[PDB]
């Protein structure tokens, strides 16, 4: 049986690569986290609240320009708030009505909507008058578009509710370079701040990091038995923090190939949906199902600050890629921004 | 610009706020539910209740069905007819019911259901969709309810099977009761008239019964 | 959700293509990590709370 003997080969290579992994597990940060100072207290109280919405926010994305906020709600709507004018401009209904994940573009020319509808919409922006038009909608990827990306204003990569990972292109609207190695049911992924890299999500936790060109030789990140919901990078192109639903954030590192510290320090019995690093690479803001969110040191593995503005879960949150605000999107129609 | 376009921002959001207000009010008034994104909308008595299926995705769904907050129904009922190759769909349906009945956010969801009546020959067809001692023992022992109607052309088991399913369903709902909460049985009597009619009746009772879960002291 | 027979084939092909990946010392990788973090530790006002002096959304 070629299937059986080949799978047995698969466990043999798995054992070998785990032996290499353990050998690479030479040491641990112990001294560094023991002697380096604890991060200190955090307040980051209520600063900007997006009380405008009326449904359950399902996703969100700050724009690398730190200008306008996409929120792929569940009304047939996909609002676009603003960073520093405290309000919104293009509240733009949708052809289909229910979408889970958002997306966005660096500049403002595009903005997407790929989620429950099973269609990756891509909106447009000509003028700020009423009835904001729609650009080329994209489809052809079965199962709800679980999360999709715009590296620059021309390239679209998606990994969605099909257990596949595909790169479309806005104009041509066909596969550019897809990726097929995954098995979970993706629910979020994020992009390196240098735009050269995005890292996948997973249910079987194998949060894959593959390169935009073709997904070159990389690693699938075992462990971490719950789902991942919350992946974002710190500006080093080597590590992230897969947020979690079993309360256990992690800090898998691309360079070292290894996870570093889980965050299973109890008093939390809930889930987490989105986490984006304060670019210092030190704080790591992941929100908890209760009406609060609790800080996590990236290098001390000790919680240090509370973030409580919601009532129900927090569905997606984020930090400004400039370093000026942290934003949170709940299920209870409440989208909060903390300083 | 912004040194003068402050009025531009206020007018933009105010205009789209009025538009959004009205459109999502049209949404928020109406009510909705899963089914056997096909908004095959019906309309009765001052509301066009917003019926819609979801089928088409893959099967494993813990996060999609996670989305349904304020989506107030279950309808799926199956019979393992010719169309083995078919067996034990109820405990699939009943399991799914347990799920929606102990999930963190599907727990506050006043569910309903609609059975099938093509079961005129339960034990007399194929013995697989039949309720026998080899499928449910509860069926073999079970009694008759506090109100019966064994319609002709059926064995007594094939008659009271509807009430037996009713009582198993009430078992997993309220006899285990894990949530001190309510579920609604029904069946198909007149297509598109009695079906949707009882739909509105017991779904106004659904919104009623949400009003009683949510501000119980009427 | 892929239970096809060839799903094993694709997984094992990817695994074999992963039989030769880069290997980096964990201690020195983490060393560069916290060196990077401490180098930037003066930037994010979230990290050390720098007041509304530079923050736009200091409203009422």
């Amino acid at each position, epitope marked *: 049986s070629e299937l059986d003997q080949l799978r047995q080969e698969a466990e043999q290579l798995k054992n070998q690569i785990r032996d290499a992994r353990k050998a690479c597990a030479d040491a641990t940060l112990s001294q560094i986290t023991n002697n380096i100072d604890p991060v200190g207290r955090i307040q980051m109280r209520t600063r900007r609240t997006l009380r405008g919405h009326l449904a359950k926010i399902y996703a969100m994305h700050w724009g690398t320009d730190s200008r306008l906020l996409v929120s792929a709600s569940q009304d047939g709507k996909l609002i676009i708030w603003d960073s520093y004018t405290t309000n919104k401009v293009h509240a733009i209904p949708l052809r289909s009505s229910w979408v889970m994940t958002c997306a966005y573009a660096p500049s403002g020319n595009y903005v997407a909507c790929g989620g429950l509808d099973n269609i990756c919409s891509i909106y447009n922006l000509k003028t700020r008058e009423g009835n904001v038009r729609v650009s080329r909608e994209l489809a052809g990827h079965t199962g709800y578009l679980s999360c999709c990306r715009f590296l620059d204003d021309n390239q679209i990569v998606t990994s969605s509710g099909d257990t596949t990972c595909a790169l479309w292109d806005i104009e041509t609207g066909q596969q550019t370079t897809t990726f097929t190695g995954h098995t979970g049911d993706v629910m979020s992924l994020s992009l390196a701040p240098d735009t050269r890299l995005f890292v996948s999500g997973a249910c079987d936790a194998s949060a894959k990091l593959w390169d935009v060109r073709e997904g070159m030789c990389r690693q699938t990140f075992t462990g971490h038995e719950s789902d991942i919901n919350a992946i974002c990078f710190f500006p080093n192109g080597n590590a992230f923090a897969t947020g979690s639903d079993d309360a256990t954030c992690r800090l898998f590192d691309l360079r070292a190939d290894q996870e570093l510290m889980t965050y299973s320090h109890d008093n939390i019995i809930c889930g987490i949906t989105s986490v984006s690093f304060s670019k210092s690479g030190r704080l790591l803001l992941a929100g908890y199902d209760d009406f609060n969110c609790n800080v996590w040191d990236a290098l001390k593995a000790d919680r240090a600050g509370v973030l409580a503005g919601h009532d129900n879960r927090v569905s997606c949150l984020g930090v400004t890629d400039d370093g000026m605000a942290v934003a949170t999107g709940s299920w209870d129609s409440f989208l909060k921004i903390w300083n | 610009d912004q040194r003068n376009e402050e009025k531009a921002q206020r007018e933009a959001n105010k205009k789209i706020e009025k538009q959004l207000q009205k459109d999502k009010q049209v949404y928020r008034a109406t009510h909705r539910l899963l089914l056997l994104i096909f908004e095959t909308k019906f309309q009765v008595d001052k509301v066009n209740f917003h019926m819609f299926d979801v089928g088409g995705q893959r099967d494993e769904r813990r996060k999609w069905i996670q989305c349904f907050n304020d989506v107030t129904a279950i309808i799926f009922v199956v019979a393992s007819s010719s169309y083995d190759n078919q067996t034990n769909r109820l405990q699939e349906a009943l399991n799914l019911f347990k799920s929606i009945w102990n999930n963190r956010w599907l727990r506050t969801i006043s569910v309903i259901l609609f059975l099938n009546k093509q079961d005129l020959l339960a034990e007399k067809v194929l013995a697989g969709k039949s309720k026998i001692e080899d499928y449910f023992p509860e*069926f073999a022992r079970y009694t008759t309810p506090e109100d019966a109607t064994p319609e002709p052309g059926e064995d007594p088991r094939v008659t009271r099977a509807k009430y037996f399913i009713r009582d198993e369903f009430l078992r997993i709902s309220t006899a285990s009761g894990d949530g001190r909460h309510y579920c609604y049985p029904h069946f198909t009597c007149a297509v598109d008239t009695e079906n949707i009619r009882r739909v509105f009746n017991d779904c106004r009772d659904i919104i009623q019964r949400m009003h009683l879960r949510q501000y119980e002291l009427l | *959700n892929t239970a096809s027979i060839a799903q094993a084939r694709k997984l094992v092909e990817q695994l074999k293509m992963e039989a030769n990946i880069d290997r980096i010392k964990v201690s020195k990788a983490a060393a560069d990590l916290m060196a990077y973090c401490e180098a930037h530790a003066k930037e994010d006002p979230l990290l050390t709370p720098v007041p509304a002096s530079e923050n736009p959304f200091r409203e009422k």
Partner: nanobody
Amino acid sequence: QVQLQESGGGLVQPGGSLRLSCAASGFTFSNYKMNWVRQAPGKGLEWVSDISQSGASISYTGSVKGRFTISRDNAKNTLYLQMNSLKPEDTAVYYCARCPAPFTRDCFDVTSTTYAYRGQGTQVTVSS
């Protein structure tokens, strides 16, 4: 990492003189539910049993109602359950499935195509 490798099965008679068990790996097993699911010839995703947050309802399907018992134990870190005397000569491959999202007493997903957290299978059929 989730080395949900089965243990037990392969071949057994209607006597069912064999025991099935599981393999868990590195998590708060004391907060997951569990359940076991078998596979009818091709379309088999029935819900054979479960075992709630230890010290709660332990239910079973109509085909095996009341008869099965499902074994949980922290120390051995191996989820057991006993089989015998009622269709144990089934050709249905079992699966030591695992209810996701610990710290709440519910689970979903008996999906018909390979499932994330469940084991790769557990043979059982008739010996000679």
